[PDB]
Structures are given as C-alpha cells and as structure tokens.
Amino acid sequence: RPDFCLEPPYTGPCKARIIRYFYNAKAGLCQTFVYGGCRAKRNNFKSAEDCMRTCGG
Amino acid sequence: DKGGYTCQENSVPYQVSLNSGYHFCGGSLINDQWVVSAAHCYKSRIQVRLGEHNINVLEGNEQFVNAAKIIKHPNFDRKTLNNDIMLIKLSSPVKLNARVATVALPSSCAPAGTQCLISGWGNEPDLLKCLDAPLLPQADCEASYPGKITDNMVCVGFLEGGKDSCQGDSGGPVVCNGELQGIVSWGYGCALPDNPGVYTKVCNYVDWIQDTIAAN
Ligand SMILES: [Ca+2]
Q1: Is A48 strand, coil or helix?
Q2: Would you identify the CATH topology of the domain B1-12+103-203?
Q3: Residue ranges of the domains in chain B?
Q4: Where is the Peptidase S1 domain (chain B)?
C-alpha cells in the first residue's frame, strides 16, 4: 500500500480541534485523531470510507 | 496539560465556541452581531455558542446563533498562516448581559511584556480554561521560529514552556488591558520549551475589521 499510509497521524501546528481519520498500519484499520486545521499530510481523511479505499491495501 | 486554570464561571463573557456538531474553535464577540476568529477555523456551516462555561451541559445562560456570513481576510495564506483572521456575522443580534459581552478592539499595539489573558476549551474539552501570559519580544519570537514569523504575528507565553494554548483554542482571544490584542493561531506542539504560541496580531487589522463590518 502507499507509504503515506504507514506514517503516524499529523496534527499540524494549528490549534483547531478537527476530527479526522488516518490509517493505523499497526491495527490494520482506520481510526480518528485530532487535526489542528492546517498543513495536513496525506494520511488524513474526512471519512472512514475514503481512508479505507486509499489505504486498505 | 495546557498549564492553565479553570476560568471563573462567565468571567470571560466575550468568549464564544464555534460548533459544527462539536466544538472545534473559539472566537470573540466584538459587537452584538459579529465574531472574530481565525481563518483556519473556516467551515461552510458554523453555529456560534455564547455564554458557555461547560460546553457539554445545557446550563441555561447560553445563546445559540448560526453564522450568516463568514469572511476570511483576503490575504490569508493556508501555508504560512499570515493574516490568519476571520469575521463571522451572526444570523441575528445576540442579547448582551453579564454573561454575554463584547471585547474592545485595540487602540494601538500592546508592547512586549504586557500581561494578557488567553482563554479557550483546548484542555475531551469541558470547562473554559484561562492562562495569564505576557506578549514576548519579536526577537525572541523570531528566534524560536526561524524565518516563520511575519509582522502580523506575535508570540505570547513562556520560552521555558509549561503553559500554552493548544488544540481546541484556535480563534480564541488574547486580551490585554481590556483590548483584544491576539487570536490563537499556531505553534509547534504545546507548552514546549523554546516554542511559545504564535498569535494573530489584531492591532494590524482594526481598519479591515471596521471597514468590513460597515460594508456588510
Ligand atoms: Ca453549557
């Protein structure tokens, strides 16, 4: 699967509290984390469906 | 955590919570119909909640109002966060009282060393948090964030870390001597040494704010 799917979730420098989904390689499933609101990385999805399609493998 | 203390109930009447299903950013009431917040807090649909203390319980003093217009600074940069300021016009005027009040815009830019009050639910946010911190000299801000600080930003906090605003506080107020001098924007981590919080310098946008409110 894509390499960005194996990188840990990135909150970013902004201080908002936005719930996003990221692929947890170690768990083989998408979970939620707190996104700060800016400079998102690729392992950041607005829904579990998009997260699994892209990183499900 | 944050390193702050729970604010006294309704002691920060100009503080608001931006909600789109859950609390995601803060803001400040500048007049009975307008709220100022951070541009990175933009969402097409936003409900503003005033008179809050514990955002997870219906206390009876709150006012819930939807945003009618959301206006970001035309020069906001999503990458550098320069000009990270946004205005929100409420669908209808709110009722001002002891728990819901406005905060004054700056008369001028507060000098470094000025003690201020930072508030937000940034902590599972629950009770409104408060923090007393001073505006730091621009040189120290620049030294902490090499080549990342513009003249529209100011650092507030401590170079040793320990106390700082964090996720959930964005858009919130930094008030010094009764005037809104800053808006919670960004920082590398929270409360880390040599990395104090960076805030939007409101005194550089007073005319833009006043002109925008007048034309809308
Ligand atoms: Ca409440």
Answers
A1: helix
A2: Thrombin, subunit H (2.40.10)
A3: 1-12+103-203, 13-102+204-215
A4: 3-214
Query: Could you tell me which CATH class the domain B13-102+204-215 is placed in?
Result: mainly beta
Is B40 among the catalytic positions? Answer: yes
- A chain contacts of residue B184, beta-carbon cutoff 8 Å: 15
CA pair distance B56, B17, nearest whole angstrom: 12
Q: What is the resolution of this structure in A?
A: 1.6
Tokens 């970013």 sit on residue: A12
Is residue A57 classed as helix, strand or coil in its secondary structure? coil
| Residue numbers in A near B22 (CB within 8 A) | 17, 19
Near ion ligand 1, which residues have CB within 5 Å? B 52, 54, 59
Domains delineated in chain A = 1-57 (4.10.410.10)
Tokens (6 digits) for B215: 């034309």
| Encoded tokens for B102 | 């406005």
